[PDB]
Structure formats: C-alpha cells, structure tokens
Amino acid sequence: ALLRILKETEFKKIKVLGSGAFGTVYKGLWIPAGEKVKIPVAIKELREKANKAILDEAYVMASVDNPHVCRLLGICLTSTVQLIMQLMPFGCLLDYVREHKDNIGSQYLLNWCVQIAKGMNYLEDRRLVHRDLAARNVLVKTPQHVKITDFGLAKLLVPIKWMALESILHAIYTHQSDVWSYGVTVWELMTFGSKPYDGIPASEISSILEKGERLPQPPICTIDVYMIMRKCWMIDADSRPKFRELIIAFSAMARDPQRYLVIQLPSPTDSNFYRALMDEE
Amino acid sequence: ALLRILKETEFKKIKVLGSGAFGTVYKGLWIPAGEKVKIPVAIKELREAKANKAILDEAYVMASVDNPHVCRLLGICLSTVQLIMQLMPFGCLLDYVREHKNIGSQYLLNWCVQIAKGMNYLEDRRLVHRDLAARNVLVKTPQHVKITDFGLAKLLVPIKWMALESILHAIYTHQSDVWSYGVTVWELMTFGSKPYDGIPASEISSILEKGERLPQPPICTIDVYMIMRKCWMIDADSRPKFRELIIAFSAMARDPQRYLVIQGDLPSPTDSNFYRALMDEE
Ligand SMILES: CSc1nc(-c2cccc(NC(=O)c3c(F)cccc3F)c2)c(-c2ccnc(NC(C)=O)c2)[nH]1
Ligand SMILES: CSc1nc(-c2cccc(NC(=O)c3c(F)cccc3F)c2)c(-c2ccnc(NC(C)=O)c2)[nH]1
C-alpha cells in the first residue's frame, strides 16, 4: 500500500545524475497513465536474491515516515531493479559542502548534524540498520532540510574508512556501528567534504584503529564537537553515544553555533519561499 | 514575511503556458542566489491596470491566505508586475474537464465541495473573488483543486459569469461569488461547455431579467440543478451561502451515483499515496 509497483511504460529515464556503489541515478519522468503530464522523479537502477525478498525489503524501505528519512516511493522489477523516489534538485550533502566550502555557516553544519541524528534515531526505533551512513548517502531537499537515504541497500546488494572496527573484523553491523559511521559523516561535514584517511591504504585502517589513532580534529572544530566524534569511535561498541543523545548535544550547540565552530540561515520569508515551492513536508 | 520580493536576477521565464485576462503565464526557473540549482516556478506577467505600494499591499493580502483549496501568492517582481507561485503540471480545471470529457460523479462532486470550501475560506477572510470560474481553478492533483486569482480583478469581463447586480451596477459581494460558483458548477457538469453559447454578452442582462437561465445538464439530477438555480436567484440574499453548499455537495458526494447519471460510473490508496509523495505533501 505504501509501495507503488510501476510498469516500464509509465516512466522514462532522461539524463544520468550520478552513480554510487549500489547503482546508477537518473532524472526521470513519470507519465500517469491516462494523463498527459510529465512529473519529474529520481530513479536508481541498481546494479547486479529472490524476487520475493527484493520486494519484501522494498516494502520495508517504503514504510518509513520521518522528515529526515527518504522513503522509497515506487519500484520497477524487470530484468533489473529500479527504485523511484522524489527528485531533489540539490543532490547529496557531500557535494554541496564541497561546493560551498567558502560560504557555509556554522548554523547549517550543526543543524545538519542534528537532522542526521534524528533520521538515525528514527531508523534505530524501527530496528533498521543502515550499514553505509556517509555524507554521500545524505540528500538535500532544501539547504535547511536533509534526509538519509539507501539504508538496507548494502545487505540486499565495502566502505572500510567509514566502518566500525567490529564491522571490518567480523562483519558485524549494529546501531552502534552506525554510530561510528555517523562520527565519520560529521567529520566529513566539518572538513567540508575531505576524504577520511586520504592517501592511507584501506588495508592499514584496521591497524591504525587498533593502535588508537583516529581522524584528526577538524580545523573549524572546538574540542566539544571533536569529543563527540571520538566517543563515536570507541572500540567498545556499547560505550559509544546513542543517537538520541547526539541530537540533544548538537541541538544545544546549534543554539550557540559561533562558540562551537570557529570559521573565518534563511530569513523567515526565504524559508517559506523555499518551503512553498519545494518542501511542504 | 509571507511575500518574497524578487529581483529580476533570481528568475527566468522559459516557456509560455497561456494567456488569460489578467495576463500571460510562463513556466520558469528560480535560481536561488549562491546556488547552481534551477527550481521550476510559475510566473504570471500581469497586464497593466495604482502605485507600486498599493500593488504590494494587495499582493500582501494575496500572499496571506492559508487554505488547502486556495492558491497562495508566493513572490512578486515589480517594468512589469510579475507574480510567482508554485508550478502545477496539470494546469487549470476547465482544460482538465474538457480533455477528459472519462470522469465519474465522485470526482465532479468532490471538486464542487473543494471549490466551495476555498470560496467559504475567502469569505471568512472577507475577500471577494470577482472572477470565479473553471478557468481560475487549478489542479494540483486530480483529487485536489485550488482557486486562484482572487482579488486580481479589483487590482487591475466575464459577463456570462456575473450576477445581474454586478452587470448592472458593478456590485460585487460574496453573494455574487455564489452566482459565479453556480456557473462554475455548470461548466464542470457539462464537461467544459461555454455558458450561454451564442448569446451576445450585451443581451445577457436582458435574458436574465426575463427569467432565462443556463439549462439543466444531461448528467444532472434535479437536486443538483435546483442548487444551481438557487445560486442564480435575483435576490442576492436568497442564494445559498458557501457553507451550505459545502454540506449538500458533501452529502451528495457520499452517494454520488444517486445525484449524477454518467454512463459507466476513484483512486486507490496506493496511487493516492504516490501522487501525494511526489506532488502534494500538503
Ligand atoms: C547515493 S546517490 C543518490 N541516490 C539517489 C536516489 C534516486 C532514487 C532512489 C534512491 N533510494 C531509495 O529509493 C531508497 C533505498 F534504495 C533504500 C531505503 C530508502 C530509500 F528511499 C536514491 C539520489 C537522488 C534522489 C532524489 N533526487 C536527486 N537529485 C539530484 C540533483 O541528484 C538525487 N542520489
Ligand atoms: C489564468 S490561468 C493560470 N494562472 C496561473 C498562475 C501563475 C503564477 C501566479 C498565479 N496567481 C497568483 O499568484 C495569485 C493571484 F494573482 C491572486 C490571489 C492568489 C494567488 F496565488 C497564477 C496558472 C498556473 C499556476 C501554477 N502552475 C500552472 N501549470 C500549468 C501547466 O499551467 C499554471 N494558471
């Protein structure tokens, strides 16, 4: 009821928007049968499991209801699998911070951390494990609104530099390892999209973590934010913070952003403009 | 606070969509400052009429409406007055009914209900549309319609839509909006027929005085036609109030096949949820 199965004849891929490990992303047009309208959408043709299993996980993916979690809207099952969701012209968060390296404000970064924590806490409440949280898997509806996508794709279909030690060593994935990946994502945002452990071979990461080394303190970060990152990267999974707690912490910091980030928001009207044209959510 | 004043630099007209009385409509792009994104928008360049503040003050009123069945003006640019609003791919209801001449009684009755709701809202905010008509009703989804362009007439002639008092003394009230509502219902029930086809507008006042009105639509039972006829009474105070129209049509919509007769006379929860997730999160 929440997942619309689509025929091939009712939609069309128009241009390629990007790619990821799980597949290719297109701008498409949905033509509602019996109408003459073209409605833009985002289509992910997954790369190369029984059909009943694919469909069951697509239902799970389509049952989420949270302002910061993307919901799968439609699926097309043929020789390939095509996922359909709302088209968001702003793209993914990693690309955006890289494009706005010299103008992003501290309010946005703290608010993005808050929103990602809300999405993650929601998924934990639904007993869902993302397995690949990262700045590239967070989409921008509006500069003030971000949404996590693609949870569960990893299990159905390896980002070593984002994974917890337990995941690299014993292929264990939990909400706590998602917290580790959250720490890495916050690090990505605070560095304006820097590559974690740039130039370091992935095969050394297990070693570097075992001797106690972690990603460096980001230049714009006071010790307050970096401590949260470090707690997300504790070897003992049960000692890392809970998403529910990170929301509060980052929200407090958002109440006074200039004190917690040191770098060299929309007016009420612009926000309603943005919301009326693209975010009635 | 509710009206964004725009600068010619933030947007662009890209395609012409149509013309009407108050102006020409284009599909356009808002390029938010600082960004590289082009966001689809709807622009209406208005025809000349009032100083710019007067315009803006009426634009502020037009921008303060908050009702699911009333279009809200979002932005304005003031060489030409350009109004901006969200782009709605389905266009106006009149063209929709003409293109699907394939429509069941439930859709028709629900459109009447939603239009009356929007009108009753405008009456509550003490605004008089002055040009209610199928052409001024836009379709967000086939299940969701919205009145637009209220107030645009005063700020800047649909004779076949106006009450006798409006034709004779340029008197406009909520009760004359009730008249135009009746004519709008007639357009919908006839699948977009042109009211008083063939009768010169100059003679409309005469035929109305002699007691002649629009004919009963073939698909209409006497109940619906009686509602229309009551909307076209000479005594303004005897016509129905929008809040009463919302009830009767609502009731009729609860048993649609008893009040409209369509040969071969409904969206699934799945498809409804889809439309809403792509185009109507309201
Ligand atoms: C990683 S990169 C990326 N993937 C997508 C995409 C597209 C279609 C479907 C899903 N994913 C799902 O449906 C989905 C899933 F697979 C599991 C759980 C929940 C879900 F919702 C992702 C986008 C994207 C999306 C919208 N708009 C834009 N706009 C621009 C300009 O890029 C880009 N980007
Ligand atoms: C003559 S018909 C018509 N006019 C408009 C239009 C465009 C921009 C602004 C306003 N109106 C206002 O700003 C406004 C006002 F002037 C007074 C009170 C409240 C208001 F909101 C109307 C459309 C339209 C709109 C969106 N999408 C589509 N899509 C397609 C395919 O046409 C068509 N159609």
Author numbering:
A (entry chain C): 702 to 749, 754 to 862, 876 to 982, 989 to 1005
B (entry chain D): 702 to 750, 754 to 782, 784 to 806, 808 to 862, 876 to 984, 989 to 1005
What does the paper say about this structure?
A series of benzoic acid‐derived compounds showed beneficial effects dependent on the fluorination pattern of the back pocket moiety, with a 2,6‐difluoro derivative exhibiting the highest potency on both mutants. To confirm the binding mode of these compounds, we succeeded in obtaining an X‐ray cocrystal structure of EGFR(T790M/V948R) crystals soaked with 6. The inclusion of the V948R mutation is critical to reinforcing in the inactive αC‐helix “out” conformation with an accessible allosteric pocket. We fitted 6 binding within a ~2.6 Å‐resolution X‐ray cocrystal structure, which showed expected anchoring of the trisubstituted imidazole at the ATP site and 2,6‐difluorophenyl group within the back pocket. The aminopyridine interacts as previously observed with the backbone of M793 at the hinge region, and the imidazole moiety is engaged in an H‐bond with catalytic lysine (K745). The amide linker is anchored through H‐bonds to T854 and D855 of the DFG motif that positions the 2,6‐difluorophenyl within the back pocket. Accordingly, this group binds through a π‐stacking interaction with the side chain of F856 of the DFG motif. The binding mode of inhibitor 6 is practically analogous to that of proximal Type V inhibitor LN5461 and the allosteric inhibitor EAI045, indicating that the back pocket groups share interactions with these earlier examples of EGFR inhibitors. Specifically, the back pocket binding group is attached to C‐4 of the linking ring in lapatinib, while for 6, the point of connection is at C‐3. The phenyl ring is practically identical in position between lapatinib and 6; however, the chlorination of lapatinib appears to shift the HR‐I moiety in the back pocket, which perhaps necessitates this alternative point of connection to the back pocket phenyl between these two scaffolds.
